[PDB]
Amino acid sequence: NSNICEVCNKWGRLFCCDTCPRSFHEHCHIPSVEANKNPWSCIFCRIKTIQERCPESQSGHQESEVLMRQMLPEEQLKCEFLLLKVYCDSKSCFFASEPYYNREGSQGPQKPMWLNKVKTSLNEQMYTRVEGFVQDMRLIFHNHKEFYREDKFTRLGIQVQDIFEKNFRNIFAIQETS
Ligand SMILES: [Zn+2]
Ligand SMILES: [Zn+2]
Ligand SMILES: [Zn+2]
């Protein structure tokens, strides 16, 4: 197995996947790495299994249909993975913890949002449909773009949003378009 965490790329106390060479810190994995379970399969392996069991799940889908899906176990897992894929980018540090807003000429957002809050919300089963999760994720980047206006720091929101959207289209097999 790898000797660094797949998500944060650091060594430390790592838990090893039994079905692939990835490793994770306890709370870098989503959900948090489970207490017992030998063997243990990581979220990448669990997602691969869903695809393998139902090869047709990779045919193209409309976003509108995906968003209305209820958060049954497989959709809950897919949102967990998508959240994990955003954390995998080092630029996710900017969006992880609760922000604050005090900048001359801007006002803070009406509804602040951050990754750790989405994490907790997923863990507590607060989303009933995929739409709930996706709306909160997109609000993270929209709030950032709106607040930082013309500062070049706005690009960080664009960059991490692009990682989110690419992963969303991949994980939920959104129909490719021009
Ligand atoms: Zn880690
Ligand atoms: Zn694995
Ligand atoms: Zn099938």
How far, in Å, from the CA of 72 to the mean position of ligand 1? 27
Whether the Cβ atoms of residue 30 and residue 143 lie closer than 8 Å to each other: no
Whole-angstrom CA distances from 153 to 78, 80, 86, 148 are 30, 27, 18, 7
CA distance 81 to 2: 19
CA of 37 to the centre of ligand 2 (A): 13
How far is residue 116 from each of residues 20, 93, 128, 131, 150, measured CA to CA in Å? 27, 10, 18, 18, 26
* Residue 125 DSSP one-character state: T
Proximal ligand: closest to the CA of 29: 1
Domains and CATH numbers, the chain: 1-59 (3.30.40.10), 60-178 (1.20.920.10)
Distance, CA 17 to ligand 3 centroid (Å)?
A: 26
Ligand number with the minimum distance to the CA of 39: 2
Structure tokens at 155: 């690009």
122 alpha carbon – ligand 2 mean position (Å): 21
Q: Which value in Å is the resolution of this experimental model?
A: 1.8
Query: Given the structure tokens 């863990």, which residue do they identify?
Result: 123
C-alpha 29 to ligand 2 mean position (Å): 11
Give the helix, strand, coil percentages of the chain, each rounded to 5: 50, 5, 45
